[PDB]
Design a protein around this ligand. Sequence first.
Ligand SMILES: CC(=O)N[C@@H]1[C@@H](O[C@@H]2O[C@H](CO)[C@H](O)[C@H](O[C@]3(C(=O)O)C[C@H](O)[C@@H](NC(C)=O)[C@H]([C@H](O)[C@H](O)CO)O3)[C@H]2O)[C@H](O)[C@@H](CO)O[C@H]1O
Ligand SMILES: CC(=O)N[C@@H]1[C@@H](O[C@@H]2O[C@H](CO)[C@H](O)[C@H](O[C@]3(C(=O)O)C[C@H](O)[C@@H](NC(C)=O)[C@H]([C@H](O)[C@H](O)CO)O3)[C@H]2O)[C@H](O)[C@@H](CO)O[C@H]1O
Ligand SMILES: CC(=O)N[C@@H]1[C@@H](O[C@@H]2O[C@H](CO)[C@H](O)[C@H](O[C@]3(C(=O)O)C[C@H](O)[C@@H](NC(C)=O)[C@H]([C@H](O)[C@H](O)CO)O3)[C@H]2O)[C@H](O)[C@@H](CO)O[C@H]1O
Ligand SMILES: *[C@H]1O[C@H](CO)[C@@H](O[C@H]2O[C@H](CO)[C@@H](O)[C@H](O)[C@H]2NC(C)=O)[C@H](O)[C@H]1NC(C)=O
Ligand SMILES: *[C@H]1O[C@H](CO)[C@@H](O[C@H]2O[C@H](CO)[C@@H](O)[C@H](O)[C@H]2NC(C)=O)[C@H](O)[C@H]1NC(C)=O
Ligand SMILES: *[C@H]1O[C@H](CO)[C@@H](O[C@H]2O[C@H](CO)[C@@H](O)[C@H](O)[C@H]2NC(C)=O)[C@H](O)[C@H]1NC(C)=O
Ligand code: NAG
Ligand code: NAG
Ligand code: NAG
Ligand code: NAG
Ligand code: NAG
Ligand code: NAG
Lengths: 324, 324, 324, 160, 160, 160
Amino acid sequence: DTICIGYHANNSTDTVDTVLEKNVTVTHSVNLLEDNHNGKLCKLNGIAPLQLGKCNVAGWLLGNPECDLLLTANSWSYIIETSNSENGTCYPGEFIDYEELREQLSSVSSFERFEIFPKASSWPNHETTKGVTAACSYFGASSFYRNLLWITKKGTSYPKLSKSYTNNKGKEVLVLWGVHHPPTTSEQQTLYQNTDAYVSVGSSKYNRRFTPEIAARPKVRGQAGRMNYYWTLLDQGDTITFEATGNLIAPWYAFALNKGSDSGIITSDAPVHNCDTKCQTPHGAINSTLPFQNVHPITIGECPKYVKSTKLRMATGLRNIPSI
Amino acid sequence: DTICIGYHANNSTDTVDTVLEKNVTVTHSVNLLEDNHNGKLCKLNGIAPLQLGKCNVAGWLLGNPECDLLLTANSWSYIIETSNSENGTCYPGEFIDYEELREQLSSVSSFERFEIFPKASSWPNHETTKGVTAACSYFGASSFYRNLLWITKKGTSYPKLSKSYTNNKGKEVLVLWGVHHPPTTSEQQTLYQNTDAYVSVGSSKYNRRFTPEIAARPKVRGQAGRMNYYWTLLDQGDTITFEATGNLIAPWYAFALNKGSDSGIITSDAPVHNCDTKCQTPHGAINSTLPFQNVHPITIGECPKYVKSTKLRMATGLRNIPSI
Amino acid sequence: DTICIGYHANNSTDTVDTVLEKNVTVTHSVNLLEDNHNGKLCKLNGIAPLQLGKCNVAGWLLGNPECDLLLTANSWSYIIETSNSENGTCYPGEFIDYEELREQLSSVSSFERFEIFPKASSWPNHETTKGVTAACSYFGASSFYRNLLWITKKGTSYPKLSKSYTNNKGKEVLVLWGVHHPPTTSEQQTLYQNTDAYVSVGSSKYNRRFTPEIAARPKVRGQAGRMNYYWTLLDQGDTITFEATGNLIAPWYAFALNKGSDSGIITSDAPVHNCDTKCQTPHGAINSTLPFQNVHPITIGECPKYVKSTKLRMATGLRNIPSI
Amino acid sequence: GLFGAMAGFIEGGWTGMIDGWYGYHHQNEQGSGYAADQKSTQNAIDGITNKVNSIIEKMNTQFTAVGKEFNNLERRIENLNKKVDDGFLDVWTYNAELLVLLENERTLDFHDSNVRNLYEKVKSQLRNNAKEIGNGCFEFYHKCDDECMESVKNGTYDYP
Amino acid sequence: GLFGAMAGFIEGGWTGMIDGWYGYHHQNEQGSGYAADQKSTQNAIDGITNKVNSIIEKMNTQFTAVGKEFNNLERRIENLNKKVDDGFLDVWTYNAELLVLLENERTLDFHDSNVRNLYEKVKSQLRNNAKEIGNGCFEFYHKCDDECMESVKNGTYDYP
Amino acid sequence: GLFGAMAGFIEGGWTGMIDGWYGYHHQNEQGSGYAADQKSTQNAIDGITNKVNSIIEKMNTQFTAVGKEFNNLERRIENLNKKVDDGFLDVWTYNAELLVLLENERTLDFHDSNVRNLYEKVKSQLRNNAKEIGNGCFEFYHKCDDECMESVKNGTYDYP
Ligand SMILES: CC(=O)N[C@@H]1[C@@H](O[C@@H]2O[C@H](CO)[C@H](O)[C@H](O[C@]3(C(=O)O)C[C@H](O)[C@@H](NC(C)=O)[C@H]([C@H](O)[C@H](O)CO)O3)[C@H]2O)[C@H](O)[C@@H](CO)O[C@H]1O
Ligand SMILES: CC(=O)N[C@@H]1[C@@H](O[C@@H]2O[C@H](CO)[C@H](O)[C@H](O[C@]3(C(=O)O)C[C@H](O)[C@@H](NC(C)=O)[C@H]([C@H](O)[C@H](O)CO)O3)[C@H]2O)[C@H](O)[C@@H](CO)O[C@H]1O
Ligand SMILES: CC(=O)N[C@@H]1[C@@H](O[C@@H]2O[C@H](CO)[C@H](O)[C@H](O[C@]3(C(=O)O)C[C@H](O)[C@@H](NC(C)=O)[C@H]([C@H](O)[C@H](O)CO)O3)[C@H]2O)[C@H](O)[C@@H](CO)O[C@H]1O
Ligand SMILES: *[C@H]1O[C@H](CO)[C@@H](O[C@H]2O[C@H](CO)[C@@H](O)[C@H](O)[C@H]2NC(C)=O)[C@H](O)[C@H]1NC(C)=O
Ligand SMILES: *[C@H]1O[C@H](CO)[C@@H](O[C@H]2O[C@H](CO)[C@@H](O)[C@H](O)[C@H]2NC(C)=O)[C@H](O)[C@H]1NC(C)=O
Ligand SMILES: *[C@H]1O[C@H](CO)[C@@H](O[C@H]2O[C@H](CO)[C@@H](O)[C@H](O)[C@H]2NC(C)=O)[C@H](O)[C@H]1NC(C)=O
Ligand SMILES: *[C@@H]1O[C@H](CO)[C@@H](O)[C@H](O)[C@H]1NC(C)=O
Ligand SMILES: *[C@@H]1O[C@H](CO)[C@@H](O)[C@H](O)[C@H]1NC(C)=O
Ligand SMILES: *[C@@H]1O[C@H](CO)[C@@H](O)[C@H](O)[C@H]1NC(C)=O
Ligand SMILES: *[C@@H]1O[C@H](CO)[C@@H](O)[C@H](O)[C@H]1NC(C)=O
Ligand SMILES: *[C@@H]1O[C@H](CO)[C@@H](O)[C@H](O)[C@H]1NC(C)=O
Ligand SMILES: *[C@@H]1O[C@H](CO)[C@@H](O)[C@H](O)[C@H]1NC(C)=O
């Protein structure tokens, strides 16, 4: 008659590491390292993302001709650019504070695209039908952005224009515009007459006054000319005022957005599916259950802390020493 | 005859948590989480803070009419704005690098307010008595900042002015000034005559040259005009030079400050009392004895690391298992 | 007959600290705190650093007269300024985005200095021999930077110049230039005739157009004039274009650099020797074997994490209790 | 281990015992078999369970988007941002790595400790009515039928 | 616990013993009472004291002002600053939280270990001159008056 | 220590034993001497070795240049950069400091545990054929020549 007190053992081959010994086979372990995704761009917390495909942020907002599908854009929790996101500012120039606008518009709740300055209506005494370029070609034909309007000279006279919009949308309004910069001081006149032209944007929170910066420079994707794009968020009840003797690429359409917080811009060619997630990465969504992850340093949401490790297995059972 | 070796027990109900079991009653514990303050704005290391009350930083430094009490400001270790700090740039415009100046002036050791360009004395051939606005109303009457002086046209002639101050204060000197921007090109003359007016500030460390940016824009708290405020720290022995054909809101008073390090700006409506502290927060002072705190993420001084936890009790005695 | 099981002991006086007791003498310990260097500026990973000595970054790149030895500069892994690095922009002015250029040029792989706009050749109808200043004196004689060329007025006529360089170097090209700012509107003409002079730099990635900002200002190390230095990295195949009616301090020599990653600028007077290292500090190189270091907060390379501690000795053997 | 039971004086485990972590294996004239000590097993379960939960649940996470986007003239703050990321990404790597190494050691020791306390629990009851065969077993100097075997398991063993 | 003394083979503590953490309670024909073992108590005090001090004193702190203030066109570096704060504020939360959990476990085990070593200290001296009643007690096979009781307490117990 | 061997029931160590960490010292009619228990010594070596390696090797490091360089109008992001540096420089200080304190405690306990398990290993074999002199020694009730002494060392001691 005998009795022995002993311990469990099984066919487990899970191994963990301890400060004293590497690879110790244990009966039962638990993984604390999220290292697999669903290779899909999911919805981040109920709301789906915004796909841009061939277009990029600047192209989407400016109204590039190749971004016709993005004209419905509504809601979204984060933006998605792809390795093909190349249709942007078809007409060369610099998009002032672009990165900044990109970040500020990552997550929007409400976002309506309205016509702030109607083409056929506003801009009297000014040419509004020749404002097209081969740089922004729509189906072979020369076109231009769809939210901006290229106002030129009326016959042989470009008089001072001065129109103003006042935000009664009950929410911020993104007002985008541009200032054109001819290469020559000869073109400055053939287009806006007044050689000493200027443009000025007023608001109870904006006052910069531009002038055209003519200068010889390399032709880009077509023109030697240049167009700087500007934006600003017009507060409720505030009134923005535009006036210019030339060189103004006036706002045509603006957006009555409604952002709450801020997320970011994922850039991947992973398929967008109707799944959900608290944590989204460029390769796919992650599971926010474990405390660590090695799927990708760049994530959006409530994510596991990114670590360089490949194995963080925690022992739960005991040393596995079978053999009966 | 018997002897037993055992352990202590008492009426303690303190509970701690262990990796293996939650809420274990122990005989004696120690708290490592500072979670209570004195709801008072104390002095941070000997020196008291600077209260601004109804005024805010821009209002204090510019000389807003509602900030008469702040004209004595001396020493201070950190600045205090309140939910009423609203009297600032009574006259609309943009305060260039405001945040930057705010941070750089958080902690000052020596700070004297002197008259750099005496009103009654300097500015000959120029009007120095009409420089008042209803935007900066002092007791119903129209006034203006107390450290800046609004130089206008002398009758029907505004000639070139060109005065310069050289820092012999044996310490930095904060020189604040402004450039006025009329809405019309008509006002630009009714006030500074010269339509192509300009302003230029020179120093062995500054050289920007401004011009007025007339442009139609919304009226703010009164005027459709705008005033950009500028500042700069003039090194010992250096000489700043002002000259302008118009639109200059010349320095009247400057400050011979003496900053050593930098703290910050607490913004709270908590009472300021003559207590001291190594760590100060918006809700009150904290005790810097423990290693962690949950009173507030935003602190100033040598503070306990802020954590989201609500309970960090450490066991010191043993498991409490009484019952005799 | 007896047997006793016991433990080792020796003459060790190493002491370690434990959560329960301070300074415990152990038989054998291990140090985990790198606290000694070789007081030498070594080579960071095969490639040696760049010494500037009396010259500083701005002086080196601009072509200051006192930096003749730095005209060979080749390869380098990190730059070294000393407490004597003072010969920089001998001619007063502001070096736009200086810190930025400093950081971007910390580590270069390939870097050739070529003559982008040959002095004797380019600039016809313009004076290219009087462009010298006493501020940049070379051996008593008045000189000027060696990479820039001070173009002035030809007799009594300074016509519009317009030259352009196109990068066919098969790698980036650092193009440095300057815009001169006279104190008076009288000097603006005695030097560049045209009072309303301007300068404009074009590229498929640059379009700013400058004008001289005349303004009275303190004389610095000689002149009351001022020269702003500008730079830009011209991409392969892109073409930069310069044109100006005056005030342009044209590029003479440019650099066909080839940077891969970025390091930094060590500033120390420690001797540079032909040693190597994965981690370099201002006081000397560190050993990257241990996990922590207290030699210096500022390091370059793969370094041990900097800590405020002075002693991190880990026990490996046991408590040392000798005495036979 | 730290307590010398696992792979110690009680080298090797039992494939046979399938209803727990620690337990017994008796052998009397009536038959034999394995039986996990239910309490110590349940407790160890609860603790390890609680330990895992703590390590997992104590991890706080703010909703955030790591990426930043800076232009060719914001290299310095880009590198700063880089420093922050590699900074935290280096802290959590050293932690996650060691937290596990150190905790795994603890857990193993925990089990080992549990086995030794169970062994010692029995060795207590029996005492002289059994001889210790230094392999985690006891050989009753008397007859111990199933009621007796049960007795020692539920800690109610008679006159020692 | 890890050493099986607290709530283990010596379940429950003594409200009566009021002059220490670990100690004894004798009972002979002369009378009874509690008496904390002064050394082990003092030592445990010193160590825990030192442990707390370490956890507290090892915390370095630079004089700093967390807040920053950025304008509507510095959102990116504002978020960066945000990332840094939530970043450290997340590191110290996971640490403070676990440091305590893990250290508390240690401290309890420490005490448990101290009790077991004291028990074992006595069980050593007595040996055969007493029987072990598996409850943390010893019953002298002989008479042990107060001098004798003191003897075993100050570790000077005679012929075992 | 935590296991009561070092500076515990086996106070003081042996300058004499020079071929290991833990071991024995016999004394029979033939002569005397020290002899480190080779296995437990080798193992302890391996583990501590592995422990040090882990603490060292688990430290990740990205090639980076800490310094930044900001101008008089970038004070805010300079302070931000400052915050990041003091931030990490404060995390690693509290860690390095405690990691060592806590691990040192562990290592000492490890050794102490090893000594106690070795002692207990012998006390097991001998049992009745030796008396325990509470100082880490055993006095054979019989004659134990060198072959016998070796026997108990290599764990092959006869009829107990
Ligand atoms: C075959 C060919 O290349 N075209 C030759 C003509 O070149 C013209 O050169 C001018 C520059 O002065 C412009 O680049 C012309 O292109 C447009 C464009 O953007 O596509 C034409 C647009 O209609 C025009 N937009 C406006 C204002 O209506 C646009 C703008 O003028 C510029 O962008 C302003 O910077 O330019 C281009 O066609 C050349 O003029 C002609 C001479 O007879 O010969 C053609 O072969
Ligand atoms: C009742 C009423 O609203 N006033 C009417 C007059 O309006 C004037 O409009 C001008 C704009 O051209 C200014 O806003 C006038 O206000 C001041 C101000 O700031 O308060 C008056 C100040 O004296 C003046 N400061 C100076 C330079 O001395 C200031 C400046 O001019 C501007 O700030 C420059 O931008 O303007 C305001 O009173 C209106 O002119 C008059 C016509 O007869 O009718 C009034 O009812
Ligand atoms: C002894 C002495 O100090 N010189 C007196 C002359 O002063 C001249 O003042 C002018 C300012 O108008 C300049 O500073 C002159 O210095 C130079 C310089 O930089 O060294 C001379 C250079 O040759 C010139 N460079 C050029 C364009 O060729 C340079 C530039 O003009 C300025 O930097 C432009 O901003 O100035 C300095 O010598 C004084 O003119 C003379 C009157 O007869 O008396 C001298 O004693
Ligand atoms: C938008 O982007 C596309 C590319 O993503 C532009 O097309 C480019 O790619 C062509 C080949 O597909 C190349 O030939 C050119 O580099 C370029 N343009 C041409 C000639 O197609 C496209 O033009 C852009 N459209 C707009 C209006 O932005
Ligand atoms: C300074 O700030 C106060 C408010 O903090 C200004 O007063 C404002 O508040 C009034 C009610 O108290 C409102 O009617 C207005 O919005 C506004 N101005 C008026 C009409 O009082 C006060 O004017 C400011 N003073 C100065 C000179 O800056
Ligand atoms: C470069 O720097 C040196 C100093 O590092 C300049 O010399 C300065 O130091 C002189 C004494 O050594 C002082 O007298 C002056 O402050 C100053 N200039 C003089 C008069 O030597 C030197 O001039 C500079 N050279 C250039 C061309 O940059
Ligand atoms: C391990 O053993 C279990 C016991 O039932 C069995 O279900 C499983 O298939 C086995 N798997 C392996 C690892 O062989
Ligand atoms: C374990 O064995 C060694 C580490 O000593 C390693 O090379 C091997 O890949 C490990 N395998 C496991 C269990 O992951
Ligand atoms: C706890 O007991 C102590 C013992 O003196 C006594 O002073 C105190 O009032 C009691 N408090 C509680 C928690 O009942
Ligand atoms: C302890 O009990 C539970 C945790 O298991 C919790 O709900 C309760 O609030 C805790 N109370 C204490 C001691 O703070
Ligand atoms: C310590 O003892 C060793 C043993 O050989 C000897 O080599 C060394 O010189 C001694 N050093 C000290 C610390 O006295
Ligand atoms: C150890 O002793 C005390 C700490 O209690 C300290 O003052 C002394 O400097 C220490 N010396 C050593 C071993 O570094």
